[PDB]
Amino acid sequence: XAXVXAXV
Amino acid sequence: XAXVXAXV
DNA sequence: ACGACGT
DNA sequence: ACGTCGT
Ligand SMILES: *C(=O)c1cnc2ccccc2n1
Ligand SMILES: *C(=O)c1cnc2ccccc2n1
Numbered sequence: 001x002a003x004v005x006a007x008v
Numbered sequence: 009x010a011x012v013x014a015x016v
Numbered sequence: 017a018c019g020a021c022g023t
Numbered sequence: 024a025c026g027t028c029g030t
């Protein structure tokens with residue numbers, strides 16, 4: 001849920 | 009019902 | 017009744 | 024280095 005690199 | 013990973 | 021990620 | 028959900 002975080003998007004720091006993916007942002008699922 | 010939400011789809012944040014599944015979206016049922 | 018439903019599970020996922022990459023720069 | 025980063026965590027989330029409601030019909
Ligand atoms: C988002 O909050 C979150 C938490 N855990 C995960 C695990 C695997 C893929 C994506 C994810 N996203
Ligand atoms: C984004 O591509 C990515 C990959 N690995 C991680 C590890 C820990 C926190 C965030 C990350 N983001």
Ligand SMILES: *C(=O)c1cnc2ccccc2n1
Nearest residue numbers: 009010015016017018029030
């Ligand atoms: C969607 O709103 C919702 C709420 N609760 C659930 C529980 C189990 C599976 C799917 C669900 N979807």
Ligand SMILES: *C(=O)c1cnc2ccccc2n1
Nearest residue numbers: 001012013014019020027028
């Ligand atoms: C999606 O794959 C997934 C898995 N676990 C969760 C927990 C809480 C909110 C959203 C979620 N999404």
Ligand SMILES: [Mg+2]
Nearest residue numbers: 005006021022
């Ligand atoms: Mg990875």
Ligand SMILES: [Mg+2]
Nearest residue numbers: 009010028029
């Ligand atoms: Mg709920």
Ligand SMILES: [Mn+2]
Nearest residue numbers: 001002025026
């Ligand atoms: Mn986590």
